[PDB]
């Protein structure tokens, strides 16, 4: 057999990024390994291992579209860095793949119009499966600097489709969004 030439070229492009990433992570390891900061190297390696853990959990929720969006986020152009975690045992959240993916794409887009570009913006998203009341909760804990927080006022007021925005605080440099789905 033979896969489509379109896909074949995309996967090569992606692995290309993943590769570039790991070269940096090794840069970190090798660099500190030379400065003889051994204790620091193990620390980093553990961070890498953790990062990876969540990378696989996300890949095992039967939510490919979401997973793909998160896994490739930092490779596409954005004014903030995305980090994510899946808290709780894995679940077949497939019933929500399309919903979540679309939702995040929207939020990400708003942050892009909202965050400043001279600032170092970072956004952490956590997926909670272990919650007792909700089928699944999503936390977005951003921290950086805004240039137009107003971008959120709309969604802040009229909510969003069938998702429950339980919380949406926005301070001077941070933002905390909490979304429930059931």
């Amino acid at each position: 057999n033979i896969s489509d030439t379109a896909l074949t070229n995309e996967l090569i492009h992606l692995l290309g990024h993943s590769r570039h990433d790991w070269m940096n992570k090794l840069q970190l390891i090798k660099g500190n390994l030379s400065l003889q900061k051994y204790d620091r190297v193990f620390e980093m390696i553990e961070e890498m291992v953790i990062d990876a853990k969540h990378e696989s959990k996300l890949s095992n929720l039967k939510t490919p579209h979401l997973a793909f969006d998160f896994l490739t986020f930092n490779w596409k152009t954005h004014y903030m860095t995305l980090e994510y975690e899946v808290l709780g045992e894995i679940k077949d959240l497939s019933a929500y793949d399309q919903k979540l993916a679309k939702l995040m794409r929207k939020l990400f887009h708003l942050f892009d119009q909202a965050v400043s570009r001279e600032s170092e913006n970072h956004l952490t998203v956590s997926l909670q499966t272990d919650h007792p009341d909700r089928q699944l909760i999503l936390y977005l804990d951003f921290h950086g600097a805004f240039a137009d927080p107003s971008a959120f006022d709309d969604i802040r007021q009229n909510g969003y489709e069938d998702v429950d925005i339980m919380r949406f605080e926005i301070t001077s440099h941070e933002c905390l969004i909490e979304i429930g789905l059931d």
């Binding site: 290309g16 590769r19 570039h20 070269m23 940096n24 090794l26 840069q27 970190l28 390891i29 090798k30 660099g31 500190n32 030379s34 400065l35 980093m44 930092n74 152009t77 954005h78 004014y79 903030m80 860095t81 570009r117 001279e118 600032s119 170092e120």
Partner: protein, 119 residues
Amino acid sequence: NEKILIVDDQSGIRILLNEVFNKEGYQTFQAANGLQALDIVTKERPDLVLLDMKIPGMDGIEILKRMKVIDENIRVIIMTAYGELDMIQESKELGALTHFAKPFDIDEIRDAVKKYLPL
């Protein structure tokens, strides 16, 4: 007393290199992004700059192009991963002294700076 600007989105890398050029008694500065760099260049007017190519938002070629507008005699050593033949070539045409592919030897990097840097 010689000024060196470290520009990389990756934090650990800025920390690493920063802790390197201090052992050489250099005045180290660091930016995590394009705009932050361009300011540090304007104000501090560094001597040598270590620029990452893959930075989210504004990539090295774009900022390298801008640093040039500010100070045409800006000494830039770009650093990136092997397989960025495009930017590596572009940065050369734009006036980048040389380049280092990650993961580079913490040693030869420190020399290339001492090299390209007067006294």
